[PDB]
Amino acid sequence: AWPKVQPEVNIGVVGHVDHGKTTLVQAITGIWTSKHSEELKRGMTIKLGYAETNIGVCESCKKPEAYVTEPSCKSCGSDDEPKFLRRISFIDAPGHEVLMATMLSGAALMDGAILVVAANEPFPQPQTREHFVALGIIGVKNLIIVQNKVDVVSKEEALSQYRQIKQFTKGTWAENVPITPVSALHKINIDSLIEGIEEYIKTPYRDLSQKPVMLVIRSFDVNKPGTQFNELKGGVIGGSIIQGLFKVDQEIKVLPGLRVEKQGKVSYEPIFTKISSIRFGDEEFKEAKPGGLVAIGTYLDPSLTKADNLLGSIITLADAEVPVLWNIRIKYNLLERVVGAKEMLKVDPIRAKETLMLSVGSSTTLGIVTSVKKDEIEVELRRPVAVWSNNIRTVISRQIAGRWRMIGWGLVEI
Numbered sequence: 001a002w003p004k005v006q007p008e009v010n011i012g013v014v015g016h017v018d019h020g021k022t023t024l025v026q027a028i029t030g031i032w033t034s035k036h037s038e039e040l041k042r043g044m045t046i047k048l049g050y051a052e053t054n055i056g057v058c059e060s061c062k063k064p065e066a067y068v069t070e071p072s073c074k075s076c077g078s079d080d081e082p083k084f085l086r087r088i089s090f091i092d093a094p095g096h097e098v099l100m101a102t103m104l105s106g107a108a109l110m111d112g113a114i115l116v117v118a119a120n121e122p123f124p125q126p127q128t129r130e131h132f133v134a135l136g137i138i139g140v141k142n143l144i145i146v147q148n149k150v151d152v153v154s155k156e157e158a159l160s161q162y163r164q165i166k167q168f169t170k171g172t173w174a175e176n177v178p179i180t181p182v183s184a185l186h187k188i189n190i191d192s193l194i195e196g197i198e199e200y201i202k203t204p205y206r207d208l209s210q211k212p213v214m215l216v217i218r219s220f221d222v223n224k225p226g227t228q229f230n231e232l233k234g235g236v237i238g239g240s241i242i243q244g245l246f247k248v249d250q251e252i253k254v255l256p257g258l259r260v261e262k263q264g265k266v267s268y269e270p271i272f273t274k275i276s277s278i279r280f281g282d283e284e285f286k287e288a289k290p291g292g293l294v295a296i297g298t299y300l301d302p303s304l305t306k307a308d309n310l311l312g313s314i315i316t317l318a319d320a321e322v323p324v325l326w327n328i329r330i331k332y333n334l335l336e337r338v339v340g341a342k343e344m345l346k347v348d349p350i351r352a353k354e355t356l357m358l359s360v361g362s363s364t365t366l367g368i369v370t371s372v373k374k375d376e377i378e379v380e381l382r383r384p385v386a387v388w389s390n391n392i393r394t395v396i397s398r399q400i401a402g403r404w405r406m407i408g409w410g411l412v413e414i
């Protein structure tokens with residue numbers, strides 16, 4: 001039998017709207033990531049989606065068909081159990097331009113990524129570009145490019161686009177990134193993609209001695225309506241562990257924490273609590289390591305965690321020393337052009353007093369530029385940000401025609 005373990009690696013799925021990210025994740029895992037009513041209704045990803053699968057290989061069979069996502073080799077005529085390789089999980093990002101920030105949040109949780117490119121749409125589309133560049137900036141460079149929807153175009157058309165993709169990646173960090181043609185919808189050539197995932201998105205080394213840090217993207221509670229009020233389960237906080245590991249009964253804190261109102265004046269106070277449970281998907285564990293999306297059960301009042309209230313927070317051990325900053329200095333670099341815009345547009349230099357959007361970890365925060373230099377800006381934040389390390393990368397966005405567009409990036413200076 002295959003072991004029941006947590007996913008050991010996170011693979012982002014990104015790309016332009018409707019190019020088939022969620023359907024690809026379904027093709028691989030059997031799971032439709034969209035759980036929210038508005039997502040199902042509007043037919044779009046809004047919040048980050050999530051799905052896990054085991055990966056195995058039938059050692060006596062021919063590749064890529066030998067790769068399986070369930071413990072059976074019957075499809076290659078063997079009654080032998082396939083060799084378990086690892087459990088993996090997917091971070092399914094929204095493609096809509098208006099949701100770029102969400103993609104950015106998800107990118108902080110990715111060990112590698114799949115860029116989905118629709119074979120029946122002109123390449124390169126705005127968010128194909130924006131997601132690609134964002135991946136490059138953030139350092140998610142273990143990339144597979146998937147040409148999806150090949151089922152509706154001839155092989156020749158798909159090859160023409162393939163040539164375009166090679167042209168696009170040439171001279172960039174992605175020059176030798178593999179391109180794999182599939183049909184996510186009708187499940188064609190998925191095995192080649194599994195093989196490619198095993199080859200190009202290896203589980204990274206984890207230094208489990210590092211201080212535990214989790215980036216928070218969800219928060220909620222299991223309590224069904226009409227639940228007896230003093231028998232409510234504690235709040236649950238969901239996210240991904242980016243370093244170290246957490247264990248049941250650990251004393252933890254959520255940073256920056258809780259918004260506090262004092263005569264209409266606002267501060268943030270760390271939220272202290274204790275880990276009552278650890279879960280990945282449908283399985284309970286006693287500890288939680290990088291890879292996968294974890295649900296940390298706590299003793300918190302469910303009202304504190306309701307409706308993703310804590311999105312963008314981080315969680316550390318209670319005694320961790322972590323700067324929570326209302327002002328930050330950023331060593332920055334700007335892109336030459338607003339890659340995510342439909343019509344070509346140059347990036348204007350940063351101006352003092354302008355409002356910028358900053359993506360840091362899973363958080364998204366508006367701030368006012370208080371100082372501009374050639375290599376550095378200083379920003380007064382509308383809300384504080386937890387900065388858990390010295391070389392944290394931030395992505396900078398500017399509001400352009402009412403739309404937040406990525407325009408640069410930088411290092412948060414301590």
Ligand SMILES: Nc1nc2c(ncn2[C@@H]2O[C@H](COP(=O)(O)OP(=O)(O)CP(=O)(O)O)[C@@H](O)[C@H]2O)c(=O)[nH]1
Binds near residue numbers: 017021
């Ligand atoms: N013909 C064909 N259609 C596909 C394929 N993959 C996805 N689609 C279709 O494209 C549409 C959008 O698919 P979906 O998987 O939701 O794309 P998405 O990129 O996650 C959309 P969003 O960016 O909002 O998250 C759906 O109608 C879906 O059935 C494919 O391989 N072939």
Ligand SMILES: [Mg+2]
Binds near residue numbers: 021023044045095
């Ligand atoms: Mg989707």
Ligand code: NA
Binds near residue numbers: 107108109110111112
């Ligand atoms: Na990463």
Ligand code: NA
Binds near residue numbers: 150151152153155158
């Ligand atoms: Na085809």
Ligand code: NA
Binds near residue numbers: 168
């Ligand atoms: Na190029």
